[PDB]
Amino acid sequence: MHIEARLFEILTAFFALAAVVYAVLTAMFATGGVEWAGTTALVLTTGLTLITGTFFRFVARRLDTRPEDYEDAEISDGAGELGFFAPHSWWPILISLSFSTAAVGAALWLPWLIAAGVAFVITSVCGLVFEYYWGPEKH
Amino acid sequence: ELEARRPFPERMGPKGNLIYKLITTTDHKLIGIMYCVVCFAFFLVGGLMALFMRTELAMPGLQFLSNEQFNQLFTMHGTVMLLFYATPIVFGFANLVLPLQIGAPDVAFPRLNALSFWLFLFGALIAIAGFITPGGAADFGWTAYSPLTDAIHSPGAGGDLWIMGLAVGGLGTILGGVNMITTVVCMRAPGMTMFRMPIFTWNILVTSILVLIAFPILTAALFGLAADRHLGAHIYDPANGGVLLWQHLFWFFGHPEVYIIALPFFGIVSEIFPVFSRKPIFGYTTLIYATLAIAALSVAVWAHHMYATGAVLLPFFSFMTFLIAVPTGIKFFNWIGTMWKGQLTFETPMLFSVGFLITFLLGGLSGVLLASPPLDFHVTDSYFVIAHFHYVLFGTIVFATYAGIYFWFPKMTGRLLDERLGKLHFWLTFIGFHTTFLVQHWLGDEGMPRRYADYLPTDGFTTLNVISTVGAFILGVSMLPFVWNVFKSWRYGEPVTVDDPWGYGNSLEWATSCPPPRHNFTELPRIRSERPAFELHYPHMVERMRAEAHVG
Amino acid sequence: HTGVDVEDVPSAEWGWSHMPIGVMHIGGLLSAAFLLVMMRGNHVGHVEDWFLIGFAAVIVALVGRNWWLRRRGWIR
Amino acid sequence: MSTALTHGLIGGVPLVLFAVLALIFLTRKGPHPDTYKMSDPWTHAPILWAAEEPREVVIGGGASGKW
Amino acid sequence: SLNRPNMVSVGTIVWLSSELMFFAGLFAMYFTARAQAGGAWPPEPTELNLALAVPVTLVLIASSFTCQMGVFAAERGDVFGLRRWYVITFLMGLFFVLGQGYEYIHLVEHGTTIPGSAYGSVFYLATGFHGLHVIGGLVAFVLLLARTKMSKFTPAQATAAIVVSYYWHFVDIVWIALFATIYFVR
Amino acid sequence: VLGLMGGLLQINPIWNLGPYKPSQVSAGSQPDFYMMWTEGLARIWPPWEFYFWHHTIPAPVWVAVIMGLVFVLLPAYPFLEKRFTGDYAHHNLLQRPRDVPVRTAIGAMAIAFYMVLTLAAMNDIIALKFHISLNATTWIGRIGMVILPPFVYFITYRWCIGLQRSDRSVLEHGVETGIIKRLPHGAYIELHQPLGPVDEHGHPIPLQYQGAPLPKRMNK
Amino acid sequence: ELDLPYGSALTSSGRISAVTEPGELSVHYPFPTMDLVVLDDALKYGSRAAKARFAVYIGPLGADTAATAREILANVPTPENAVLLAVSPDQRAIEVVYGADVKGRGIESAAPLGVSAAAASFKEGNLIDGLISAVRVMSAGVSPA
Ligand code: HEA
Ligand code: HEA
């Protein structure tokens, strides 16, 4: 993919420019020197876009043309078998209930509720991860 | 040859057809419907709070409310209306019509979708359930300023629920953004490159990037605040730089938030205009570049909300907001150009889009007026600011959302909403809105600051409050035609037995059966431009679309 | 069994799957009457009777809508 | 300002405006075709309506009558 | 069809970027309130024992190489090498977090607390969240090993192993940054 | 398990209390969880007494008759059901709870009633730990006692029928595998897997329901 | 190689993709909606209680009327187990056709009843109303088998 990488490179360039400009303009002309709270956010949003753009760049350099990236193409090119898309599942609502229990146990300071919520989150996430890998029962 | 049909399609459906499919679903269409319904319920709740506020603000004197109850009212109104109605409605429209527009069978991660929806719902319910506490809900502002939300001040048990509900909702939103980015990048039709996809999809991609940048820092700030409230963590004391630290963090979050809830509705209206103008979208790549520019600039202006503290570098942020004012102008001009010299027909989506245009123009004018420091030195923290952001918020979310509903109701249901009720609804909304929020500019220019529960009769401005509350009640009554229309037209109402009930459609979603099948597609057309359905239904038009595409 | 149709309840011959509608209607009416009479012995307050009357009115409205729609043939 | 008239406006203006707008808009003609009356001829295309109920050319009988 | 650029990889990458922004917020909390306390800004009752902060950093750095060897053995279809390397990684990550807990105990024993100081607050809140992320990574390791145990090895298992691996690499390098900021710059 | 939780968890520490004296009292006065419904019923029942000639009928009489009515309605249920449904045959095969929607809804309603009565017994603990008013909890219980059972009945009925429909769908078609194809003329199908024989054109012939559970995941 | 009247287009499958201008419908039935609904639940619930598709035809029969009616009956999905009711408001003619599979179930004792009810209701100018009455009586007559 060539255009996504270019988008992220544009964003990273602008963010780095803005971060450096803000840092050096608040080093002077400011009440107490460098501002130290917007500077950090700016360098690390630069780092975010940089990470994403670099990953996309490597994947693009390690890839041959794709029917999506390619113009000139027809629908007989993508004829094949896509991945695995999960049909019906009921684990998400249980995960959300467990996380909400832990959150309300953290709002009102109740340690037992926090412990129960964490245990339920571990259980529900385990159920979600193993859903399509449990084998038949051994009897 | 004759061919058998039914006298009328089935109204409701069998018994037991929905409740179990609602819990274990993974398809994006049902999840988008659920999004929309619950977000409108929360909209009604917030509006009720606003009506209580108005009916108290008329008639000087505390007639039936208190000071605490008024503070809780405006806090919860702001919180609900911004975080439990707009941010999820964005993902509602996304889940509805993004995979259809890119030609995909499903979203990238189908269970993360349902996880996001349920996280949103339960976080909202947690945050709202502070009213059953005897002390009440959160009583600080929507913004939760620096030492007022401490443990000494604001000691109740509503602030805790506020914080935790916001944290859960933010987690849900981050997951939704991840899913949308991955879906737009990977799953895509075998013919369309990224410079052929519709503008709605591009706006959604950019908004998801902004979400990923913005929300984690809010979760960090909220965890710091909860640590400070439950452990005495000396993080935000004014003794340290604790008063300005919170403001910097919060506003670095909070401006990207308003742009997040602004961009996709620009997309919606830019997608409705060409269908009813019978023309192409004016300046495709120009609109894409304007969107990218607004996105890049939205994160480096966060401090134009902190002029009156006397602790920021004013020229930097003032100049850069003046700068961000430009791409919105080019976007506006491209819309007006797309409407220029076409064949206009004003059905309800077009009508709501024109209303959006007018209201957003006035709001943006007031905002760019607000962006200069020596003027914000007077009009900040007054009702001028309230009028401004109510213009922009209303004109964007409310009008573009009603437009999107009236536009995509057939593509998700197979029925048609009534049009006389739609026109009545639009005119009621327009009149009530412009009569409830127009006088507040004058009301705030002369001294009347925001967040007051009472005032004295010796002061002025007692007639303007009466006009504003009359307008608020008109706006409140304007919602009955819409819910009646939706309640009747979902079961009865003229069925749609064709594709593209609004002729001259685009965007590859008007090339599949009106209620789309599971997996959304039974065949795809050959993709050569950004109007594939138009070239599919009118094949005698490609020569004329390629010949005269550059006159201008 | 007394009788429902299989296209409504697929497993209609495997177990009890029908309860008469008069039972539900008159039960709703009786529960509304109970909610209404539960405010006898007014113990220094009226925040509670607002809720009582609201819930009773909602129940009566639901029962009335169902009865009226069944009487005119809009349901079965 | 004269509490009675404040309440009066707040309670009366919205409903009055609703009334005028409803009488303006809700009394027009919808896009539905107006009913067919059997005194006049039948010009619509032929109509065949099935039942669809039971999921999945020798005649057995017949009858007639001409009104 | 299958559009070779993997999907789980893109998802994990974008989520890792968001988590980086979370840690950005924490860092911004730390840097302010350090420009306020003048002079010996670590108050006198605190002394950072360096003789124990270096070993745990080195065991984490070595665990990175162990995880990389595991994913190497994963990309070719044999599970037992994956299991051995990931068990090693789990063990030494557990050792790291145990050492961190020991330092917390010995530090609160005669000095800093969360409600006692501002430096104590920023220090504990900057290191405890990283500890929580490490614990989440350990739980992920356990779940992945069990899933490899319960059925046949296919490419999906390899993808899961890869994404868990470089999530762990992310947590490792962000710890490197935290450590170099807290202990050496001061 | 009993030894472990009798060694590690503490129950009834009588020494923290004192000997019984008719003049002193404490704040948590609950019985063990199998009498909490009796206590809750006594808490949320309104004060209705009758005073006639030279006599008095107090309020707890109501608790007495309601308790007795419950204890009489429990053992006499099979005869009620056989009188109402009119089925008197021998049965040795069990029913799945989803095949009998009305009885499942009745049972869910009774369980909801029991849960409301049990939670109405820990009013003090709930109102103290979770910051809620005490009068609020009393009225919440008093109203839930009437509006929660029917709501639960409705939802349980609809849920049972939904489960039945989900079973019939996998009987008619095959088991969904979750794999998607693109079918060179741009169509998406989902590759079901049949449970029995197939017809000439590849579609499976529908089976008949036999009261037994059906698989839903391909890995089972 | 057909005309495809200005908006229709044949896709890669056999499906037709039609469109409509913003201000029209796609049914054009000269009857009210609240009578179409009634005719529909009649046609459905009477077909449940009889195990036989019921159909209704309204176009012209400009030939030997019974011939044309049995010509039309071959368009129901399972014509052999089906009951059709044809009506031509210009020729003022009623025709009821059966299938071979639906017979011996009390049908010819009910067809003249339905025809007479439909005629008696048509003699005032109620088309949908007489159709409803006839479908009701014929569905109540036929027995399941
Ligand atoms: C959903 C949206 C939303 C949008 C889009 C905006 C858009 C803008 N906002 Fe607004 N704003 C809010 C929501 C929004 N705002 C909220 C909620 C608050 C305060 C909340 C709180 O404090 O509690 C707020 C507060 C706020 C403030 C500070 C108020 C304070 O003092 O407290 C300022 C100025 O600094 C500001 C400026 C702007 C500017 C410059 C734009 C620009 O984006 C708009 C530019 C738009 C145009 C329409 C220009 C039209 C273009 C052409 C026609 C070319 C014209 C050219 C010239 C005149 C040069 N906003
Ligand atoms: C996206 C957002 C959004 C929307 C839609 C609104 C909508 C409205 N707002 Fe709000 N508002 C804010 C965002 C929004 N607001 C923010 C951010 C603030 C300031 C925050 C703060 O200071 O902290 C604010 C503050 C604010 C104030 C001043 C508070 C203060 O004093 O400072 C006022 C009133 O003057 C007001 C009025 C209104 C009115 C009249 C509407 C009308 O649009 C709404 C009309 C709505 C309805 C009436 C709903 C209809 C309801 C019924 C039909 C009742 C039915 C009930 C049931 C079925 C439950 N808003």
Ligand SMILES: CCc1nc2ccc(Cl)cn2c1C(=O)NCc1ccc(N2CCC(c3ccc(OC(F)(F)F)cc3)CC2)cc1
């Ligand atoms: C209100 C309950 C309660 N409040 C509190 C408060 C604090 C604490 Cl710590 C505990 N509680 C409890 C409590 O412990 N409840 C359990 C309980 C309830 C009732 C009965 N009664 C026994 C026999 C009677 C009886 C006897 C003869 C009869 O024969 C006749 F007359 F012919 F019918 C009928 C009934 C009724 C039930 C025992 C235990």
Ligand SMILES: [Cu+2]
């Ligand atoms: Cu300000």
